[PDB]
Amino acid sequence: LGTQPDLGSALYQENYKQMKALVNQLHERVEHIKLGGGEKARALHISRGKLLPRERIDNLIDPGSPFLELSQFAGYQLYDNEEVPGGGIITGIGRVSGVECMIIANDATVKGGAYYPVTVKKQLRAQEIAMQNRLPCIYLVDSGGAYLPRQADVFPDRDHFGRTFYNQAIMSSKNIAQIAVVMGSCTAGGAYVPAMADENIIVRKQGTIFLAGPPLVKAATGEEVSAEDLGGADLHCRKSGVSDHWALDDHHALHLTRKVVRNLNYQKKLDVTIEPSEEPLFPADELYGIVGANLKRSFDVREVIARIVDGSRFTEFKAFYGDTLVTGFARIFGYPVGIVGNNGVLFSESAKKGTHFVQLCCQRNIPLLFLQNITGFMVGREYEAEGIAKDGAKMVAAVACAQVPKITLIIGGSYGAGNYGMCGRAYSPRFLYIWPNARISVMGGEQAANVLATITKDQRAREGKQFSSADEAALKEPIIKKFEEEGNPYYSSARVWDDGIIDPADTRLVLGLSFSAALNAPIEKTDFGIFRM
Amino acid sequence: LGTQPDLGSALYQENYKQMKALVNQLHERVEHIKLGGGEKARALHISRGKLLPRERIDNLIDPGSPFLELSQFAGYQLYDNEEVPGGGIITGIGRVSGVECMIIANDATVKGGAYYPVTVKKQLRAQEIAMQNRLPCIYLVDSGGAYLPRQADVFPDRDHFGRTFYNQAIMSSKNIAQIAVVMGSCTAGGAYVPAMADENIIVRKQGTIFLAGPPLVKAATGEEVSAEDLGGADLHCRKSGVSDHWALDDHHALHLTRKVVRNLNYQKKLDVTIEPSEEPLFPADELYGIVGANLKRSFDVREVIARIVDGSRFTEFKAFYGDTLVTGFARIFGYPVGIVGNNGVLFSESAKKGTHFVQLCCQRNIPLLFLQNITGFMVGREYEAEGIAKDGAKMVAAVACAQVPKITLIIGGSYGAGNYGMCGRAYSPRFLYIWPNARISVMGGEQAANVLATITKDQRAREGKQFSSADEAALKEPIIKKFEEEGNPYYSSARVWDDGIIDPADTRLVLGLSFSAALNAPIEKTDFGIFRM
Amino acid sequence: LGTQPDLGSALYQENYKQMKALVNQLHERVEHIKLGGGEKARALHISRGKLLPRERIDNLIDPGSPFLELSQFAGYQLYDNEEVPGGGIITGIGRVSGVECMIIANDATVKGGAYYPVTVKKQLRAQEIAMQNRLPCIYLVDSGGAYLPRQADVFPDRDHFGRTFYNQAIMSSKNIAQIAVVMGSCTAGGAYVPAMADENIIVRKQGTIFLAGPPLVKAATGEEVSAEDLGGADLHCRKSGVSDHWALDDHHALHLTRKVVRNLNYQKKLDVTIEPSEEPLFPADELYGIVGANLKRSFDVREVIARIVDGSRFTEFKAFYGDTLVTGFARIFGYPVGIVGNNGVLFSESAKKGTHFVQLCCQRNIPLLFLQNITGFMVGREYEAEGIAKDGAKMVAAVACAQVPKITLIIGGSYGAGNYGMCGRAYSPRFLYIWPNARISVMGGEQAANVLATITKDQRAREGKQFSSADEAALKEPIIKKFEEEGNPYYSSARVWDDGIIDPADTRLVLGLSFSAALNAPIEKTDFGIFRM
């Protein structure tokens, strides 16, 4: 697959310039988030002899191994006047002692490690990923408890803080190791995390564990006791017994953690056929010129596929039927993958073609990759008469029931029911990524504006009043602004709707790491519902 | 080997604090050198569509592979008022298409890529390393020619710029691939580099090659011609034939370079037995407390060995004979290594013990690792009568003739003939590294001061004049200051006397990468001279 | 590489039809040659309990293994009134007990196995192939002696019958096993073959060995003795001792041969790097439409390459310089190969480009593949002034000295010194194959006609006589006919100038088998002569 793009063409020059600017914007913002709370907080953190949260991960994972961080932009401008870089927590997938593990580390520099509502959501998403892929969980616990001013959004509900301990217990019952490294203070609910873990490590003086903190002890019983005496490694290690290992410092604790993982007695087994890897025949950075940042212009999704699959080899299925949808078999890093990508408006033929393809992949136990660039469903009286809704529902039913690993990458628009049909967040893909130029919302911003313009214009006629052209613009403008802000990738990623915003040049690497992790769990047989023919 | 150090001891606390400060100083200085010429130069460089020199290496090497940079501090404060970060050139060893290659990239942001005298020396050292280890050489050529104000130290001599082309021709005759990537302007001698290469890649518009630049053409013949017309990819690619491959941009050129290396038809073969790797039983960061920054205090070199070898396993040879020297067999990353380390003043017994050990390693084709922490030779009338010089010479003769790969790591003092006996720079070790606390000079600063104090005091008596205690201090002070400045690791590393200053915590990784690269060449049989018994 | 051809185009339709007819003609002629002497001769052969020559080979080689027959068309219309299918001998490369061996079998049904002059040449070519590639030789001996009417072209000269025994002695001295299976009568020189072999097998009653046949014994000494008594397996096996193994019938003899090869204690070792094989991305049969049968039309050789190399992956070298010649790196069945192919008339730049490429392949020990489709050298006063001859000679010198395995495939014209520069038969390529549309001669038929027309035209003017247009046609016609007959592939293949005429669709398979066999011998270092710069 693939063709050499015209580098001299003005369109390519403009597209490359716009996309490059978006990538540069993404890179520098991550640099700021990399610093966490700030210099003053970082200096205080080091002054206590503790390692910085990201240095802990560097020492924990195998030397030189890549680290797949998730949801770097959680909490980005989420709260009005509070800056919470990364949501106050760092989560990602890395290799420890040769085993792919999910790492969850609190960032004590950010608001002293307090749990904001986004912080709980990011952690719950990380636990969900580990459970689905059978990845051992490592908790680098350094937390300050729940953020009281927003307790109503942290404590009570099912997907609130309490769910964190529920996930630990369920994963433990499934033989998915839970390892807690207490590298700081953990109070109230935090003290449960080391208690719920299968194996636990606590640092000599930094680590403190207690259901009730000294402030509560004094208020309840009028006793003054230091945190170390109330908790501390020595009390738990030697008297309470809550501690399974005792560590001198952060470096020692991380060294012990690597030993614990090596004793899990786990060996990875692959259910899929493997072939030697090959690089794509075209450079990845050409994706900048091909795609650009203007969603109104259209491109061939095959060009994107040609630059991420091994050897740019692709076997298209039903090429000339439902051409607005592209499906075929390829390989990424030697893994077999079935690719479904949008190439225009969805039709009845496209939905039928997609439904057929998904059954094929499920039958052969082949992972599925979805490339979402949608613009809606075909609109017409004839199409409804032929059951376009009946056809669109078919794809949704098949995609939901599929038990093969599914990864979704939004390279453009994502609107309305087209999002559901292409394995949206609601359909539990193993991972979901978005490019910096993407847009997601219930409908396109223009459609909402035009719909309101038509509705108001008719309503004015019914009332007998007149809606002028200037009146039309006044109505449309606020709507278009609203959908632009709430469909922006940063808005979508600030809340955890996706697992990260990725540079298009990094697409192949991210997919390779993600599919590799998703293969730690055995692939189950797929059971489908009734196909409404 | 190894024992758990007393973390509570005051000595350990002081040593850790001092060593940590030295490492932090080293890290931040490298951060400044990482920026090259500066923001203005970097902005200009990018404005021309060219990649930054370090981004080129990142794209060239295999994804996620470690990169062993060499001589990061070359030119650090070497010239009075000129700042030349990294010497204007970046050299290191990385993996390209699964093959370990030596990468030599000019830094156009630094003085427009001009060749300072240190720049030539750094490049020549890189070529020397590649030839000895049979590593393919990749030249990312973006240079502005020789620095005229210092031409006398660049052009004429054997180890001056001319030697660069001599090395290319010799390496080519030995089937050590030479690949040149012209990613910019190359003039006068620079134009020879692409011409001398086995395969050559030139970017479409950035790359220019011409023996005589436009300025010389106008002066000699009074003709005005642009650099692209005089050189340029199109002229060389299609008409001159100097170019073997034509590249659209930097990304394309780097992609082509990876393809060229894959066609070398080379497969690495190991001459040494291999065993599964194991991590040391003790943390590396403990080396901070053990060693410290005070050279007057002494430590057990076995503690250093215990924290870098696989499983902290070590078979000492002649343990109770010549105890001031430690020799034994160990393994690093599964490679067999013979270790020679100082543990005090060298004696006749120590030299004999070392000479015996070196023969054993040479006989079995085992790589040698030297750990230099010297304080001199034993001084005494009896020792000279027993031929201490005759014994010290024995070790020097054996070390020089040894043909097994040799790596030297200076973890402390390096003075006088003790430097020669422990495989100094003059004895062609494959690599030479120094810790941030090291000191190297002809003799210790104090010894030079005391020697002059004794000489002057006697001379004053002969003249009949009096040399007072204040007179003694006045003489000593300038000498001690001179040896402190010129024995400093940064002074030694600014000039290319070593291949880099490394954090002690990184010692195991650096040695593993270095020994792995040194094994690309077959190990030859060792022929010794006459042993003066 | 490669593009989808226009199947609907008239040119493709015409080219496919013409080449298909040539392939059909080739196939049916081989079918006739497959029958050897004929039904009466075949019936007599079987009546004696002997296996047919091609059935013997089938039972000798491993079950289902491909057999690479050579020079199937030797002796095709070579002798005025005598039909000698295949030259009276069958030669090829096949696998015996997992070892690639050269098999040389006499065809007793053809003229009773007598040795015609072509028969000697075919056998000597097979021995040369085995010697160069270190292939064990297996002789299935069933012969009737030399053909007396043509003795002068069989016995005396260096490349005559005597050379057969010389080759056996030399190969034996180099540890290239020589195995003789006497499955019939062998007289005079034929008796030497079993005697010269390292190990020998004779059938109980069919096999007879004697320096002098019964007819000569009676004439010389007047004694009547049967062939079995004079020779026979029993006499040689038990009393003469010439026989090492005694076989009951042809099946037993073939079974013993496989055992003998299994005891050679040989294991194949590869000197080249290997990668997993991949099929080309385009169908092979499309070569019919692309190439056709008209040599005046031109095609892009890259299209031919795209349909024989693994994955249609090709790294071109000096693409835009000397574009009439195509050079690059690829892989066939996982082996590395450098491909040199004509794409027009040879120029000075093309020869310089080719000479540079050949040095690269020799340096890296990469096998070389030549695709000859030539139309001559550039003709012009300026080109001669610039030393086109000096440039053309450069390629010839490099090609001759190259020590890497070399295979040549003539896919078009082959005229003049262009043949030499592209590794003609005189330059000892390991194998030389030709497509059914090829033409080879000192110069093109038209050039010889035009040259003679010009010479006679001027000569007539000098004599004062007139050469009319009808006179020109009368002169040209016989020359064009002669060059057409002597340039035909069957003319070139009837005599052993090439190793076979192969269907283009079979090109990839034949090359894969040939390169695999050629890799049995270690690749030597190449020593070049003086390059006349």
UniProtKB/Swiss-Prot annotation, chains A, B, C:
Pfam families found in the cross-reference section: Carboxyl_trans
Highest taxon above the source species: Eukaryota
Residue(s) carrying N6-succinyllysine: K40, K111, K465
Phenotype when changing R125Q: In MCC2D; mild form
Pathway note: Amino-acid degradation; L-leucine degradation; (S)-3-hydroxy-3-methylglutaryl-CoA from 3-isovaleryl-CoA: step 2/3
Top-level EC class: ligase
Domain CoA carboxyltransferase C-terminal: 279-525
Entry keywords, A to Z: Acetylation, ATP-binding, Disease variant, Ligase, Mitochondrion, Nucleotide-binding, Transit peptide
Intracellular or extracellular location(s): Mitochondrion matrix
Effect of mutating E69Q: In MCC2D; severe and mild form
UniProt similarity note: Belongs to the AccD/PCCB family.
Task performed by this protein: Carboxyltransferase subunit of the 3-methylcrotonyl-CoA carboxylase, an enzyme that catalyzes the conversion of 3-methylcrotonyl-CoA to 3-methylglutaconyl-CoA, a critical step for leucine and isovaleric acid catabolism.
Assembly behavior: Probably a dodecamer composed of six biotin-containing alpha subunits (MCCC1) and six beta (MCCC2) subunits.
The protein, known as: Methylcrotonoyl-CoA carboxylase beta chain, mitochondrial
Gene: MCCC2
